[PDB]
RNA sequence: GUGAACCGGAUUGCCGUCAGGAAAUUAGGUGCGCUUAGCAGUAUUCCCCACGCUGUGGG
């Protein structure tokens, strides 16, 4: 087994972007590697200070693969803070509604197997980016397998519907990290950079 | 402890509350349409009732200037007085305070020859200090001044009064059946007259309404300060008025002065409602009637709640009132209530005795 | 361990939470519109109440400023289509028309407490943790959000409390993926419990093996709207009393009482 | 323990005053339910048991 399959499904979820420096908090259209790695660090029972010490680079070195079963909806909420006490603070928090994601991490077999075993029973709680988004489908619902390419690993998993009817999207959105390939091979025209590389638990590249 | 009052009432064809277009108010509960009478309508009808007259000592209005003007022989208290008025921070917003305070203190402060700011601040303190009234305690109060067009030197004190009564919107126990009445207006003298006629459309409905009241004793007592006899009198008079008052809507055309066929009174430490017993609408069968079926569903819901949540460290009791014991709640065997009454005066007596050593004639002195 | 608590409720015409524009807040799920309640209301409705106040107690449950609190809550949603309405009112003078909006809908509540986290946060104390468990259960069951109470006295009690001990934290939002309508033979609440019970009826046949099964204690008001409206044994025990439910939970896990 | 943890849009409101759907109307003209039979003068009374080569006893 080279990759383990994880599911991020619920009524709501959140994958914050780099555009969060004030009361207005925003998200992205796909999960980031930093949130997944934080979820894993919670899963194996490591604190915020121990993760930075020779624990995160092993997870970061693994390849990135995520599949989006269906698109989501961003929703703005009028969260208020500090009413009736002392520190009325106001803020706005955005949520992704009716979305689901499949998590794939390819690399060493031992690390993937250990991650799946810890995902069978996380030491601490597991959620969807924020404490106010519990998972709907089991994260370990889909057991690991042996594959060569990330595309085959992501497309091997089928798509599950909810009832007999309902329209389906004709595009299945999938996201992968850019393989360097041979030495050199500068990034192409359609290359995207996310500020989501965990270095500490905040520091991103 | 907290006082609860439930009611089951049936009304004749009438229009007690109507919306902008002239139709009885309706809502959605359980996926089916239901008729409703607004809470504000009930509160206003209770407040201006003949049984609440001995405790009516407050005014909410915007004609504060005309009240002081009546309390003066000098006609020179109209203008600039309306500027003491138009500077405490008031756009002709409705003000609420004890009536007995204005006709003395506003006259004693306004008529003196002093500065505008000093008199305005004195009247502002008078208004923010005028809370001694039962209706203010019951229906609460919020007063905010307009900081954009107020005197920069004057300052407002605390003027927030927490209410001590919660009244739910009347909800029909069954589906809604709106109706339309076609009317014509006649001319006394014969002649050519109009054509097809000025046919109008008046809307009305009849429904069995489940009403839900709640009076918090501790908050009402705190609001009326150390006095407690006054609070007991207020509670008794309020119960009597609720039992024997109706909204004054299209009453000259629909005299729907019906009185409730069932009252359940329960003394709880936490708010409890029985409105979920009607998520399934009541359908009339050839045996029994609407009121008895509604009371039966109510009894099912109450005994379900009782055989659900229960505590030994805080017991509760209830009295079920039906006129001359005609509609029993625990009709088969269950004695959910303890002191069932066929009289309303004895209901007030039992409530007052449970509250404390209060007799009605004793508290009819404040 | 994981202690999952689930809740299905129906509410009267009211406005328990409105946005900045005065409208009852909404969301999107199951392909339709859903009325909502925030989680930051339901929390702090459970908290800072005169009922919940029964090694600093309850701070392990609800942290303040690396406390690592052990109380996690989900988000509220609707179980059918939303229907907004507008109320038209006038003010008397006793000597202009506005608009207020309201809706009626069915909502959900969820609680989960990590027992090991609670005990460790108490410096090894477990009896205090058990007492805190009982106190939280009682307070959450006996509290409601503080909305527009003085005008819309919406105080319906919860119509279902389900307790589980799954190995993984999972919520049952995938039961109402379709809108729940009304027929002549049923109402909202009776349909609500059945389809949530349908979720438990499924899965267990085609999911986690019986070698490590999941138990639970069920609570319903006087056995109405019964969890598992048949002879199926999906629930180990059905309980019609809150104190009895707390005692059952205390007996299974730590071993204790009240 | 995830651009994360600690986090309540809150308080204040009668849609009130007025109204005849009214004047005029036959559902009337046509039809057979008719042909048939002892609760009694018998030739095995549906089942069970005992006593004889028909007489008692139970359903």
From TrEMBL, chain A:
Give the residue range of the signal peptide: none
Q: Specify whether NAD is a keyword of the entry.
A: no
Going by the UniProt record, its keywords in alphabetical order are: Metal-binding, Zinc
Highest taxon, organism lineage: Bacteria
Keyword ATP-binding in record: no
This chain belongs to which protein, by name?
A: CRISPR system Cascade subunit CasD
Q: What is the lineage of its organism?
A: Bacteria, Pseudomonadati, Candidatus Cloacimonadota
Q: Which residues of the full protein are shown?
A: 5 to 243 of 388
UniProtKB/TrEMBL annotation, chain B:
Q: Can you say what this protein is called?
A: CRISPR system Cascade subunit CasC
Q: Which organism is it from?
A: Candidatus Cloacimonetes bacterium ADurb.Bin088
Encoding gene, per UniProt annotation:
casC
């Amino acid at each position: 087994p080279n990759t383990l399959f994880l599911r991020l499904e619920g009524a709501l979820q959140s994958w914050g972007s780099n555009e969060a420096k004030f009361a207005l908090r925003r998200t992205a259209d796909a999960p980031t590697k930093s949130g997944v790695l934080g979820l894993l660090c919670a899963a194996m029972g490591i604190g915020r200070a121990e993760a930075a010490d020779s624990w995160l680079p092993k997870l970061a070195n693994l390849r990135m693969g995520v599949r989006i079963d269906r698109p989501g909806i961003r929703w703005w909420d009028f969260h208020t803070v500090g009413a009736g006490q002392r520190m009325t603070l106001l803020s706005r928090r955005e949520y992704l509604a009716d979305a689901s994601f499949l998590v794939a991490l390819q690399g060493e077999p031992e690390l993937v197997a250990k991650l799946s075993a810890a995902l069978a029973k996380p030491v601490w709680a597991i959620y969807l980016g924020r404490k106010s988004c519990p998972p709907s489908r089991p994260v370990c619902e889909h057991p690991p397998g042996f594959y060569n390419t990330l595309e085959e690993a992501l497309s091997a998993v089928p798509l599950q519907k909810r009832w007999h009817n309902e329209p389906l999207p004709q595009i299945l959105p999938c996201v992968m990290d850019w393989i360097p390939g041979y030495d050199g091979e500068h990034a192409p025209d359609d290359a995207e950079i996310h500020y989501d590389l965990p270095v500490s638990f905040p520091r991103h590249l | 402890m907290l006082i609860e009052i439930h009611m089951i009432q049936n009304h004749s064809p009438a229009n007690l509350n109507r919306d902008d277009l002239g139709a009885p108010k309706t809502c959605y509960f359980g996926g089916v349409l239901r008729s409703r009478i607004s809470s504000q309508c009930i509160k206003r009808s209770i407040r201006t009732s003949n049984d609440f007259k001995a405790l009516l000592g407050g005014v909410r209005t915007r004609r504060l200037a005309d009240l002081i003007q009546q309390e003066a022989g000098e006609t020179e208290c109209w203008k600039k007085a309306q500027e003491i008025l138009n500077k405490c921070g008031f756009t002709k917003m409705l003000v609420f305070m004890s009536k007995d305070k204005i006709k003395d203190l506003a006259r004693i402060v306004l008529d003196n020859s002093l500065g505008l700011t000093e008199a305005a601040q004195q009247v502002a303190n008078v208004i923010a200090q005028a809370t001694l009234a039962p209706d203010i305690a019951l229906c609460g109060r919020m007063l905010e001044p307009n900081d954009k067009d107020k005197d920069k030197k004057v300052k407002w004190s605390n003027t927030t009064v927490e209410a001590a009564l919660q009244v739910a919107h009347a909800i029909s126990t069954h589906i809604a059946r709106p109706e339309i009445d076609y009317f014509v207006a006649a001319d006394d003298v014969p002649g050519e007259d109009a054509g097809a006629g000025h046919i109008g459309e008046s809307m009305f409905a009849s429904a069995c309404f489940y009403k839900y009241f709640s009076i918090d004793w501790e908050q009402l007592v705190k609001n009326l300060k150390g006095d407690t006899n006054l609070a007991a009198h207020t509670v008794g008079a309020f119960l009597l008025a609720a039992a024997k008052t109706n909204p004054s809507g299209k009453q000259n055309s629909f005299a729907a002065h019906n009185y409730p066929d069932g009252i359940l009174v329960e003394f709880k430490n936490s708010p409890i409602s029985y409105a979920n017993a009607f998520v399934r609408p009541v359908s009339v069968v050839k045996e029994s009637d609407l009121v008895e079926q509604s009371i039966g569903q109510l009894s099912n819901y109450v005994n379900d709640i009782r055989l659900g949540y229960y505590d030994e460290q805080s017991p509760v009791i209830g009295f079920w009132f039906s006129p001359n014991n005609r509609y029993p709640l625990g009709y088969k065997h269950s004695k959910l209530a303890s002191r069932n009454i066929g009289n309303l005066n004895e209901l007030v007596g039992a409530v007052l005795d449970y509250i404390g050593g209060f007799k009605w004639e004793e508290v009819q002195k404040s």
